[PDB]
Amino acid sequence: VKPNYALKFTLAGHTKAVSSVKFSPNGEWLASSSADKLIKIWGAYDGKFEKTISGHKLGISDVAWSSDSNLLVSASDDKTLKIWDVSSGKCLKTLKGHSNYVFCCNFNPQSNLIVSGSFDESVRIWDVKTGKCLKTLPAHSDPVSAVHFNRDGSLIVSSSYDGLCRIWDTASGQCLKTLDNPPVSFVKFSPNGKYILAATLDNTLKLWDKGKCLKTYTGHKNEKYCIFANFSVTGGKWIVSGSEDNLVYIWNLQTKEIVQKLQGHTDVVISTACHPTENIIASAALENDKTIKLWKSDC
């Protein structure tokens, strides 16, 4: 039992490396960010280009949606985040305070807060309404590669090149858990909150419960980039990630076997995303490629 993702659409238009793609929670849209300093919005089901959003002064490493699908936040080498009204394309707020590139970002499920991680080694928590920084966590001793909230916003998980994954109490700022030593290049909670998936730059993904690793997925290449990984849960239960051999890998969540590889890109697949209700994967690639692809499966 394996999925049968097949290519349906190629979303071309960025003019440099794509950095991150995300489906909107309502399923209607895909947002992408790129080194070309733009964000683009695309139809999730037919890949139709919808709009270009502009204003960052340097390349963008991440983008993320608010719960209601009405706002985006982006993280840029310009040391700022920006909050966007996706209807109008306008920048509502510029979040200033990091002292080096902002690398990763996310809303909480309430979407009154944004969390960011930076090459400055900190995690910052921001008020969406005022754009003010509410907390700066001295979270890591090297760049922060990922930050994500759990399902009720009560926890944040962060990962870093310093080899640590840390779970934080949002409200108190306290570190509740620290999860060898390879750089941790990506982390996220599962769609239900109960697990975390972490990538390390030794070509390994791990599913963690107790502070214990329950599964390890390997076979792909990941020694250089902060590649997004995902749980796919609309059909069969898979783990999905890009890879530095230019493929999308899909693994069986429970058996850990590779069940499909998707071939379309001519550079590192930096980012993948899984649609919230249909079996659709978006993939995006770096400078030699510059495209996003939409793939669909019957399971």
Binding site: D77, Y161, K224, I270
Partner: peptide, 11 residues
């Protein structure tokens, strides 16, 4: 040009 699209050099 962004941080995500530049490699973390190991060795």
């Amino acid at each position: 040009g962004c941080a995500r699209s530049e490699p973390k050099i190991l060795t």
